[PDB]
Design a binder for this molecule. Sequence first.
Ligand SMILES: Cc1cc2nc3c(=O)[nH]c(=O)nc-3n(C[C@H](O)[C@H](O)[C@H](O)COP(=O)(O)OP(=O)(O)OC[C@H]3O[C@@H](n4cnc5c(N)ncnc54)[C@H](O)[C@@H]3O)c2cc1C
Ligand SMILES: NCCc1ccc(O)cc1
Length: 434
Amino acid sequence: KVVIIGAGFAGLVAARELQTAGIEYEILEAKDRIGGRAWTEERMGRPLELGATWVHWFQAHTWTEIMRYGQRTEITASPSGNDAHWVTDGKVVKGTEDDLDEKLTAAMGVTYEGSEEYFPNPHDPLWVLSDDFDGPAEVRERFLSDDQTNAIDLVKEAGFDQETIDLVDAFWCAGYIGDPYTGSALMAKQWGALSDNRYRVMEDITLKWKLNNGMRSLYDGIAGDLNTDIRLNTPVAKVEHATVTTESGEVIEASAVICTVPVGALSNIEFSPALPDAVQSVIDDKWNSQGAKIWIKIKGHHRFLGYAPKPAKMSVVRSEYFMDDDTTILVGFGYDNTNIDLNSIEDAQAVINQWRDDLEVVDTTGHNWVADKWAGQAWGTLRKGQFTQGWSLFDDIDLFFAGSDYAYGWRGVCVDGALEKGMTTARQVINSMR
Ligand SMILES: Cc1cc2nc3c(=O)[nH]c(=O)nc-3n(C[C@H](O)[C@H](O)[C@H](O)COP(=O)(O)OP(=O)(O)OC[C@H]3O[C@@H](n4cnc5c(N)ncnc54)[C@H](O)[C@@H]3O)c2cc1C
Ligand SMILES: NCCc1ccc(O)cc1
Protein backbone atom coordinates (compact mmCIF):
# COMPACT_ATOMS: atom_id res chain seq x y z
CA LYS A 1 0.00 0.00 0.00
CA VAL A 2 2.86 2.36 -0.87
CA VAL A 3 1.51 5.32 -2.86
CA ILE A 4 3.84 6.63 -5.57
CA ILE A 5 3.08 10.16 -6.77
CA GLY A 6 4.06 10.52 -10.42
CA ALA A 7 4.72 8.12 -13.30
CA GLY A 8 7.99 9.60 -14.51
CA PHE A 9 11.11 7.47 -14.56
CA ALA A 10 11.61 7.77 -10.78
CA GLY A 11 8.10 6.62 -9.87
CA LEU A 12 8.05 3.87 -12.50
CA VAL A 13 11.38 2.34 -11.42
CA ALA A 14 10.40 2.70 -7.76
CA ALA A 15 7.20 0.75 -8.47
CA ARG A 16 9.12 -2.02 -10.24
CA GLU A 17 11.55 -2.21 -7.30
CA LEU A 18 8.70 -2.56 -4.79
CA GLN A 19 7.10 -5.20 -7.01
CA THR A 20 10.30 -7.26 -6.91
CA ALA A 21 10.09 -7.15 -3.10
CA GLY A 22 6.44 -8.22 -3.06
CA ILE A 23 5.30 -4.87 -1.65
CA GLU A 24 1.95 -3.53 -2.75
CA TYR A 25 1.97 -0.14 -4.46
CA GLU A 26 -0.07 2.20 -6.62
CA ILE A 27 1.12 5.00 -8.93
CA LEU A 28 -1.04 8.13 -9.15
CA GLU A 29 -0.22 10.33 -12.17
CA ALA A 30 -1.81 13.74 -12.77
CA LYS A 31 -1.49 13.62 -16.56
CA ASP A 32 -3.11 11.35 -19.16
CA ARG A 33 0.34 9.92 -20.02
CA ILE A 34 3.40 8.39 -18.37
CA GLY A 35 7.03 9.46 -18.77
CA GLY A 36 6.97 12.83 -17.03
CA ARG A 37 9.74 15.08 -18.31
CA ALA A 38 10.73 12.30 -20.69
CA TRP A 39 8.24 12.54 -23.56
CA THR A 40 8.69 11.00 -27.02
CA GLU A 41 6.00 12.36 -29.34
CA GLU A 42 5.43 12.50 -33.10
CA ARG A 43 5.91 16.11 -34.21
CA MET A 44 6.96 17.75 -37.48
CA GLY A 45 7.06 14.36 -39.21
CA ARG A 46 9.21 12.44 -36.73
CA PRO A 47 9.21 11.15 -33.15
CA LEU A 48 10.84 13.99 -31.22
CA GLU A 49 11.97 14.11 -27.60
CA LEU A 50 10.15 17.04 -26.03
CA GLY A 51 12.19 16.47 -22.87
CA ALA A 52 14.87 13.86 -22.16
CA THR A 53 17.00 12.76 -25.15
CA TRP A 54 20.64 11.65 -24.71
CA VAL A 55 22.15 8.57 -22.97
CA HIS A 56 25.51 6.83 -22.44
CA TRP A 57 26.89 3.53 -21.16
CA PHE A 58 28.80 5.42 -18.42
CA GLN A 59 25.35 6.20 -16.91
CA ALA A 60 24.83 3.06 -14.84
CA HIS A 61 21.09 3.28 -14.22
CA THR A 62 20.08 4.47 -17.68
CA TRP A 63 22.35 1.97 -19.40
CA THR A 64 20.98 -1.01 -17.45
CA GLU A 65 17.45 -0.12 -18.63
CA ILE A 66 18.68 0.27 -22.20
CA MET A 67 20.07 -3.27 -21.96
CA ARG A 68 16.98 -4.62 -20.17
CA TYR A 69 14.47 -3.35 -22.74
CA GLY A 70 16.33 -4.37 -25.88
CA GLN A 71 17.85 -1.02 -26.89
CA ARG A 72 21.58 -1.98 -26.67
CA THR A 73 22.24 -1.35 -30.38
CA GLU A 74 19.36 1.11 -30.86
CA ILE A 75 21.41 4.27 -30.25
CA THR A 76 22.58 6.81 -32.83
CA ALA A 77 25.04 9.69 -32.42
CA SER A 78 23.86 13.24 -33.03
CA PRO A 79 25.35 15.01 -36.09
CA SER A 80 28.97 16.12 -35.67
CA GLY A 81 31.42 18.08 -37.81
CA ASN A 82 28.89 20.90 -38.12
CA ASP A 83 29.69 24.37 -39.40
CA ALA A 84 29.90 26.34 -36.15
CA HIS A 85 28.89 29.91 -35.36
CA TRP A 86 29.22 31.82 -32.12
CA VAL A 87 28.26 35.30 -30.98
CA THR A 88 30.76 37.10 -28.88
CA ASP A 89 30.87 40.90 -28.52
CA GLY A 90 27.66 41.25 -30.51
CA LYS A 91 29.21 39.80 -33.69
CA VAL A 92 29.02 36.33 -35.26
CA VAL A 93 32.22 34.28 -35.59
CA LYS A 94 32.33 31.30 -37.95
CA GLY A 95 34.44 28.22 -37.43
CA THR A 96 34.67 24.48 -37.27
CA GLU A 97 33.00 22.45 -34.55
CA ASP A 98 36.53 21.36 -33.63
CA ASP A 99 37.51 25.02 -33.19
CA LEU A 100 34.66 25.55 -30.74
CA ASP A 101 35.34 22.25 -28.95
CA GLU A 102 38.98 23.24 -28.41
CA LYS A 103 38.02 26.54 -26.75
CA LEU A 104 35.50 24.86 -24.47
CA THR A 105 38.04 22.16 -23.58
CA ALA A 106 40.51 24.79 -22.35
CA ALA A 107 37.82 26.56 -20.34
CA MET A 108 36.60 23.28 -18.82
CA GLY A 109 40.07 22.52 -17.50
CA VAL A 110 39.81 25.58 -15.29
CA THR A 111 36.10 24.99 -14.58
CA TYR A 112 36.76 21.48 -13.29
CA GLU A 113 39.68 22.79 -11.22
CA GLY A 114 38.99 21.26 -7.82
CA SER A 115 37.10 18.09 -8.74
CA GLU A 116 39.83 15.58 -7.89
CA GLU A 117 40.02 16.88 -4.31
CA TYR A 118 36.25 17.23 -3.87
CA PHE A 119 35.06 14.11 -5.69
CA PRO A 120 37.43 11.13 -5.49
CA ASN A 121 34.19 9.13 -5.43
CA PRO A 122 32.02 11.24 -7.77
CA HIS A 123 28.93 9.53 -6.35
CA ASP A 124 29.69 10.92 -2.88
CA PRO A 125 29.24 14.62 -3.73
CA LEU A 126 29.12 15.84 -0.11
CA TRP A 127 32.17 13.90 1.09
CA VAL A 128 34.10 17.13 1.78
CA LEU A 129 31.46 18.09 4.39
CA SER A 130 31.33 14.64 6.00
CA ASP A 131 33.09 13.50 9.16
CA ASP A 132 35.05 11.04 6.99
CA PHE A 133 36.70 13.96 5.16
CA ASP A 134 40.43 13.73 5.89
CA GLY A 135 41.72 16.45 3.58
CA PRO A 136 43.03 19.93 4.34
CA ALA A 137 40.63 22.41 5.91
CA GLU A 138 41.37 24.70 2.95
CA VAL A 139 39.70 22.19 0.60
CA ARG A 140 36.50 22.43 2.64
CA GLU A 141 36.71 26.24 2.56
CA ARG A 142 37.17 26.22 -1.23
CA PHE A 143 34.31 23.72 -1.64
CA LEU A 144 31.93 25.98 0.27
CA SER A 145 33.12 29.06 -1.62
CA ASP A 146 32.58 27.31 -4.96
CA ASP A 147 28.91 26.78 -4.10
CA GLN A 148 28.64 30.60 -4.08
CA THR A 149 30.45 31.13 -7.41
CA ASN A 150 28.95 30.67 -10.85
CA ALA A 151 30.74 28.68 -13.55
CA ILE A 152 31.35 31.66 -15.84
CA ASP A 153 33.19 33.71 -13.21
CA LEU A 154 35.70 30.86 -12.87
CA VAL A 155 36.59 31.38 -16.53
CA LYS A 156 36.65 35.17 -16.20
CA GLU A 157 38.92 35.11 -13.14
CA ALA A 158 41.35 32.82 -14.99
CA GLY A 159 41.93 35.52 -17.62
CA PHE A 160 40.25 33.99 -20.67
CA ASP A 161 39.33 36.43 -23.42
CA GLN A 162 35.85 37.71 -24.16
CA GLU A 163 35.36 35.24 -27.01
CA THR A 164 35.86 32.30 -24.64
CA ILE A 165 33.72 33.93 -21.96
CA ASP A 166 30.88 34.35 -24.44
CA LEU A 167 31.20 30.70 -25.51
CA VAL A 168 31.11 29.49 -21.91
CA ASP A 169 28.20 31.82 -21.14
CA ALA A 170 26.30 30.26 -24.04
CA PHE A 171 27.35 26.76 -22.99
CA TRP A 172 26.10 27.14 -19.42
CA CYS A 173 22.88 28.92 -20.41
CA ALA A 174 22.11 25.54 -21.98
CA GLY A 175 23.65 23.37 -19.25
CA TYR A 176 22.14 25.21 -16.28
CA ILE A 177 18.78 25.50 -18.13
CA GLY A 178 18.29 29.16 -17.21
CA ASP A 179 20.49 32.01 -16.00
CA PRO A 180 24.01 30.60 -15.46
CA TYR A 181 25.11 33.62 -13.44
CA THR A 182 22.83 32.58 -10.56
CA GLY A 183 24.11 28.98 -10.69
CA SER A 184 26.45 27.00 -8.44
CA ALA A 185 29.80 26.13 -10.01
CA LEU A 186 29.89 22.91 -7.96
CA MET A 187 27.29 21.47 -10.35
CA ALA A 188 29.74 21.86 -13.24
CA LYS A 189 32.62 20.45 -11.21
CA GLN A 190 30.60 17.33 -10.37
CA TRP A 191 29.70 16.88 -14.04
CA GLY A 192 33.44 16.93 -14.67
CA ALA A 193 34.03 14.37 -11.92
CA LEU A 194 31.42 12.03 -13.41
CA SER A 195 33.08 12.44 -16.85
CA ASP A 196 36.70 11.60 -15.96
CA ASN A 197 37.32 15.39 -15.79
CA ARG A 198 37.39 15.65 -19.59
CA TYR A 199 35.17 17.90 -21.70
CA ARG A 200 34.83 15.41 -24.53
CA VAL A 201 33.62 12.65 -22.20
CA MET A 202 31.15 15.04 -20.57
CA GLU A 203 29.75 15.87 -24.01
CA ASP A 204 29.78 12.18 -24.95
CA ILE A 205 27.66 11.40 -21.89
CA THR A 206 25.15 14.27 -22.11
CA LEU A 207 24.81 15.34 -25.75
CA LYS A 208 25.81 12.54 -28.13
CA TRP A 209 23.81 9.28 -28.17
CA LYS A 210 20.06 9.29 -28.87
CA LEU A 211 17.59 6.41 -28.49
CA ASN A 212 16.31 5.34 -31.92
CA ASN A 213 13.04 4.26 -30.28
CA GLY A 214 12.95 7.17 -27.84
CA MET A 215 12.83 7.45 -24.08
CA ARG A 216 9.37 5.93 -24.47
CA SER A 217 10.96 2.55 -25.23
CA LEU A 218 12.35 2.67 -21.69
CA TYR A 219 9.45 4.18 -19.77
CA ASP A 220 6.87 2.05 -21.60
CA GLY A 221 9.17 -0.90 -20.92
CA ILE A 222 9.15 -0.29 -17.18
CA ALA A 223 5.38 0.33 -17.19
CA GLY A 224 4.85 -2.93 -19.09
CA ASP A 225 6.55 -4.82 -16.26
CA LEU A 226 4.19 -3.43 -13.61
CA ASN A 227 1.41 -5.74 -12.42
CA THR A 228 -0.61 -2.83 -10.99
CA ASP A 229 -2.39 -0.44 -13.35
CA ILE A 230 -1.21 3.17 -13.18
CA ARG A 231 -3.96 5.64 -12.24
CA LEU A 232 -3.76 8.41 -14.84
CA ASN A 233 -5.65 11.71 -14.55
CA THR A 234 -5.37 11.39 -10.75
CA PRO A 235 -3.52 14.43 -9.41
CA VAL A 236 -2.63 14.34 -5.72
CA ALA A 237 -3.66 17.45 -3.79
CA LYS A 238 -2.70 16.60 -0.18
CA VAL A 239 -0.22 14.31 1.58
CA GLU A 240 -0.66 13.50 5.25
CA HIS A 241 2.39 11.72 6.65
CA ALA A 242 0.10 8.15 5.65
CA THR A 243 -2.83 9.52 3.67
CA VAL A 244 -3.07 10.89 0.12
CA THR A 245 -5.96 13.06 -1.06
CA THR A 246 -6.61 13.45 -4.78
CA GLU A 247 -8.01 16.56 -6.42
CA SER A 248 -11.40 14.82 -6.60
CA GLY A 249 -11.40 14.25 -2.82
CA GLU A 250 -10.47 10.54 -2.66
CA VAL A 251 -8.41 9.78 0.43
CA ILE A 252 -6.33 6.56 -0.29
CA GLU A 253 -4.58 5.28 2.86
CA ALA A 254 -0.92 4.36 2.54
CA SER A 255 1.92 2.75 4.46
CA ALA A 256 4.40 5.13 2.81
CA VAL A 257 4.40 7.82 0.13
CA ILE A 258 7.11 8.18 -2.52
CA CYS A 259 6.67 11.70 -3.96
CA THR A 260 8.35 12.24 -7.34
CA VAL A 261 6.69 15.61 -8.05
CA PRO A 262 9.50 18.06 -8.85
CA VAL A 263 10.18 21.24 -6.89
CA GLY A 264 8.57 23.43 -9.57
CA ALA A 265 5.23 21.65 -8.98
CA LEU A 266 5.36 20.86 -5.25
CA SER A 267 3.31 23.93 -4.32
CA ASN A 268 0.30 22.12 -5.83
CA ILE A 269 0.35 19.70 -2.87
CA GLU A 270 -0.56 20.50 0.73
CA PHE A 271 1.71 18.63 3.15
CA SER A 272 0.61 17.87 6.72
CA PRO A 273 2.79 18.22 8.64
CA ALA A 274 4.52 21.03 6.77
CA LEU A 275 7.81 20.20 5.10
CA PRO A 276 11.02 21.16 6.95
CA ASP A 277 11.86 24.85 6.70
CA ALA A 278 15.07 24.19 4.76
CA VAL A 279 13.12 22.17 2.19
CA GLN A 280 10.45 24.86 1.94
CA SER A 281 13.14 27.45 1.17
CA VAL A 282 14.34 25.37 -1.79
CA ILE A 283 10.78 25.04 -3.09
CA ASP A 284 10.24 28.78 -2.66
CA ASP A 285 13.45 29.39 -4.59
CA LYS A 286 13.07 26.17 -6.60
CA TRP A 287 16.09 25.15 -8.69
CA ASN A 288 18.07 26.29 -11.73
CA SER A 289 15.75 25.40 -14.62
CA GLN A 290 13.87 28.40 -16.04
CA GLY A 291 14.86 27.73 -19.67
CA ALA A 292 13.38 25.85 -22.59
CA LYS A 293 14.05 23.33 -25.37
CA ILE A 294 12.96 24.00 -28.98
CA TRP A 295 12.85 21.93 -32.17
CA ILE A 296 13.23 24.08 -35.31
CA LYS A 297 12.78 22.97 -38.94
CA ILE A 298 14.61 24.86 -41.71
CA LYS A 299 14.71 24.45 -45.47
CA GLY A 300 17.57 22.43 -46.88
CA HIS A 301 20.05 20.03 -45.35
CA HIS A 302 22.41 22.09 -43.19
CA ARG A 303 25.05 20.88 -40.73
CA PHE A 304 24.77 23.74 -38.25
CA LEU A 305 25.96 24.55 -34.73
CA GLY A 306 25.29 27.87 -33.06
CA TYR A 307 26.28 29.38 -29.69
CA ALA A 308 25.02 32.69 -28.26
CA PRO A 309 25.29 34.12 -24.73
CA LYS A 310 22.60 35.41 -22.41
CA PRO A 311 20.07 36.95 -23.09
CA ALA A 312 19.64 35.21 -26.45
CA LYS A 313 16.40 33.34 -27.14
CA MET A 314 18.49 30.20 -27.67
CA SER A 315 22.09 29.67 -26.55
CA VAL A 316 22.97 26.29 -28.14
CA VAL A 317 21.37 25.15 -31.42
CA ARG A 318 22.50 22.08 -33.36
CA SER A 319 21.39 20.08 -36.39
CA GLU A 320 19.82 16.77 -35.34
CA TYR A 321 17.85 15.21 -38.23
CA PHE A 322 18.05 15.52 -42.00
CA MET A 323 14.50 14.89 -43.20
CA ASP A 324 13.33 13.26 -46.42
CA ASP A 325 11.63 16.46 -47.67
CA ASP A 326 14.93 18.40 -47.83
CA THR A 327 14.56 20.01 -44.41
CA THR A 328 16.70 19.96 -41.27
CA ILE A 329 15.40 19.65 -37.71
CA LEU A 330 17.62 21.40 -35.16
CA VAL A 331 17.46 21.25 -31.36
CA GLY A 332 17.91 24.34 -29.21
CA PHE A 333 18.38 25.16 -25.54
CA GLY A 334 17.67 28.62 -24.13
CA TYR A 335 17.99 30.20 -20.70
CA ASP A 336 14.55 31.88 -20.37
CA ASN A 337 11.27 30.13 -21.22
CA THR A 338 9.44 33.48 -21.17
CA ASN A 339 11.52 35.04 -23.99
CA ILE A 340 10.59 32.46 -26.66
CA ASP A 341 7.38 30.91 -27.93
CA LEU A 342 8.55 27.43 -28.92
CA ASN A 343 5.67 27.10 -31.39
CA SER A 344 5.98 30.46 -33.15
CA ILE A 345 7.71 30.36 -36.55
CA GLU A 346 8.76 34.02 -36.24
CA ASP A 347 10.39 33.36 -32.88
CA ALA A 348 12.23 30.33 -34.30
CA GLN A 349 13.29 32.47 -37.24
CA ALA A 350 14.62 35.04 -34.76
CA VAL A 351 16.67 32.22 -33.20
CA ILE A 352 18.23 31.21 -36.51
CA ASN A 353 18.74 34.88 -37.37
CA GLN A 354 21.10 35.08 -34.37
CA TRP A 355 23.73 33.48 -36.63
CA ARG A 356 22.55 33.43 -40.26
CA ASP A 357 20.19 35.87 -41.95
CA ASP A 358 19.32 33.00 -44.28
CA LEU A 359 18.04 29.50 -43.19
CA GLU A 360 14.30 30.19 -43.22
CA VAL A 361 12.29 28.26 -40.63
CA VAL A 362 9.27 26.36 -41.97
CA ASP A 363 8.12 24.78 -38.67
CA THR A 364 8.87 24.79 -34.96
CA THR A 365 7.68 22.99 -31.84
CA GLY A 366 8.32 22.36 -28.17
CA HIS A 367 6.69 21.97 -24.77
CA ASN A 368 7.28 24.74 -22.21
CA TRP A 369 7.92 22.61 -19.14
CA VAL A 370 8.24 25.67 -16.90
CA ALA A 371 4.66 26.75 -17.75
CA ASP A 372 3.46 23.15 -17.20
CA LYS A 373 1.79 23.07 -13.77
CA TRP A 374 2.93 19.45 -13.24
CA ALA A 375 6.61 20.29 -13.86
CA GLY A 376 7.28 23.98 -13.29
CA GLN A 377 10.88 23.53 -14.42
CA ALA A 378 13.00 21.91 -17.09
CA TRP A 379 15.71 19.62 -15.75
CA GLY A 380 16.77 20.50 -12.22
CA THR A 381 19.93 22.64 -11.95
CA LEU A 382 21.54 24.30 -8.94
CA ARG A 383 21.45 27.90 -7.82
CA LYS A 384 24.27 29.24 -5.68
CA GLY A 385 24.27 27.44 -2.34
CA GLN A 386 22.05 24.58 -3.53
CA PHE A 387 24.84 22.03 -3.93
CA THR A 388 25.49 21.93 -0.18
CA GLN A 389 22.14 23.26 1.11
CA GLY A 390 19.68 22.20 -1.56
CA TRP A 391 19.14 18.82 -3.19
CA SER A 392 20.35 16.76 -0.20
CA LEU A 393 17.81 18.27 2.23
CA PHE A 394 14.95 16.19 0.82
CA ASP A 395 16.30 13.08 2.54
CA ASP A 396 15.11 13.93 5.98
CA ILE A 397 11.43 13.75 6.23
CA ASP A 398 10.12 10.82 8.22
CA LEU A 399 6.95 10.42 3.23
CA PHE A 400 9.91 10.04 0.87
CA PHE A 401 11.07 12.30 -1.96
CA ALA A 402 12.48 10.63 -5.06
CA GLY A 403 13.40 12.02 -8.43
CA SER A 404 16.34 12.98 -10.56
CA ASP A 405 16.68 16.29 -8.72
CA TYR A 406 17.79 14.53 -5.49
CA ALA A 407 20.19 11.99 -7.01
CA TYR A 408 23.79 11.61 -5.85
CA GLY A 409 25.11 11.14 -9.39
CA TRP A 410 23.78 12.70 -12.63
CA ARG A 411 21.35 14.81 -10.65
CA GLY A 412 18.53 16.69 -12.39
CA VAL A 413 20.06 16.78 -15.85
CA CYS A 414 19.74 13.07 -16.64
CA VAL A 415 17.25 10.24 -16.59
CA ASP A 416 20.12 8.39 -14.90
CA GLY A 417 19.41 10.38 -11.75
CA ALA A 418 15.68 9.61 -11.78
CA LEU A 419 16.38 5.91 -12.20
CA GLU A 420 19.03 6.10 -9.48
CA LYS A 421 16.95 7.89 -6.88
CA GLY A 422 13.65 6.15 -7.61
CA MET A 423 15.33 2.79 -7.12
CA THR A 424 17.26 3.73 -3.97
CA THR A 425 14.23 5.44 -2.43
CA ALA A 426 12.22 2.26 -2.95
CA ARG A 427 15.08 0.45 -1.17
CA GLN A 428 14.70 2.89 1.74
CA VAL A 429 11.04 1.89 1.95
CA ILE A 430 11.91 -1.82 1.54
CA ASN A 431 14.54 -1.65 4.27
CA SER A 432 12.17 0.02 6.75
CA MET A 433 9.40 -2.54 6.09
CA ARG A 434 10.68 -5.38 8.30
C1 LIG B 1 13.95 19.83 -21.75
C2 LIG B 1 14.57 18.64 -21.05
C3 LIG B 1 15.52 17.87 -21.71
C4 LIG B 1 16.11 16.77 -21.08
N1 LIG B 1 17.03 16.03 -21.78
C5 LIG B 1 17.58 15.00 -21.18
C6 LIG B 1 18.54 14.22 -21.92
O1 LIG B 1 18.92 14.43 -23.07
N2 LIG B 1 19.04 13.15 -21.22
C7 LIG B 1 18.73 12.81 -19.93
O2 LIG B 1 19.25 11.80 -19.45
N3 LIG B 1 17.80 13.55 -19.24
C8 LIG B 1 17.28 14.59 -19.84
N4 LIG B 1 16.34 15.32 -19.17
C9 LIG B 1 16.10 15.01 -17.75
C10 LIG B 1 15.05 13.95 -17.49
O3 LIG B 1 13.89 14.26 -18.26
C11 LIG B 1 14.71 14.01 -16.00
O4 LIG B 1 15.90 13.94 -15.22
C12 LIG B 1 13.78 12.90 -15.55
O5 LIG B 1 12.91 12.58 -16.63
C13 LIG B 1 13.02 13.32 -14.32
O6 LIG B 1 12.24 12.20 -13.85
P1 LIG B 1 11.52 12.23 -12.45
O7 LIG B 1 10.74 10.92 -12.39
O8 LIG B 1 12.47 12.58 -11.42
O9 LIG B 1 10.47 13.45 -12.61
P2 LIG B 1 9.27 13.73 -13.62
O10 LIG B 1 9.57 13.16 -14.95
O11 LIG B 1 8.96 15.22 -13.51
O12 LIG B 1 8.06 12.91 -13.05
C14 LIG B 1 7.15 13.47 -12.09
C15 LIG B 1 5.77 13.01 -12.50
O13 LIG B 1 4.81 13.43 -11.50
C16 LIG B 1 3.67 13.95 -12.15
N5 LIG B 1 3.00 14.85 -11.22
C17 LIG B 1 3.29 16.16 -10.95
N6 LIG B 1 2.53 16.71 -10.04
C18 LIG B 1 1.66 15.68 -9.68
C19 LIG B 1 0.62 15.62 -8.73
N7 LIG B 1 0.24 16.65 -7.97
N8 LIG B 1 -0.04 14.45 -8.60
C20 LIG B 1 0.33 13.41 -9.37
N9 LIG B 1 1.31 13.36 -10.28
C21 LIG B 1 1.95 14.53 -10.38
C22 LIG B 1 4.21 14.59 -13.42
O14 LIG B 1 3.15 14.74 -14.37
C23 LIG B 1 5.28 13.57 -13.84
O15 LIG B 1 4.76 12.52 -14.64
C24 LIG B 1 15.74 16.46 -19.76
C25 LIG B 1 14.80 17.23 -19.10
C26 LIG B 1 14.21 18.32 -19.73
C27 LIG B 1 13.20 19.14 -18.99
N1 LIG C 1 18.55 17.90 -20.63
C1 LIG C 1 20.00 17.96 -20.54
C2 LIG C 1 20.61 18.10 -21.94
C3 LIG C 1 21.95 18.82 -21.91
C4 LIG C 1 23.04 18.23 -21.30
C5 LIG C 1 24.26 18.89 -21.27
C6 LIG C 1 24.39 20.14 -21.86
O1 LIG C 1 25.62 20.81 -21.83
C7 LIG C 1 23.29 20.73 -22.47
C8 LIG C 1 22.07 20.07 -22.49
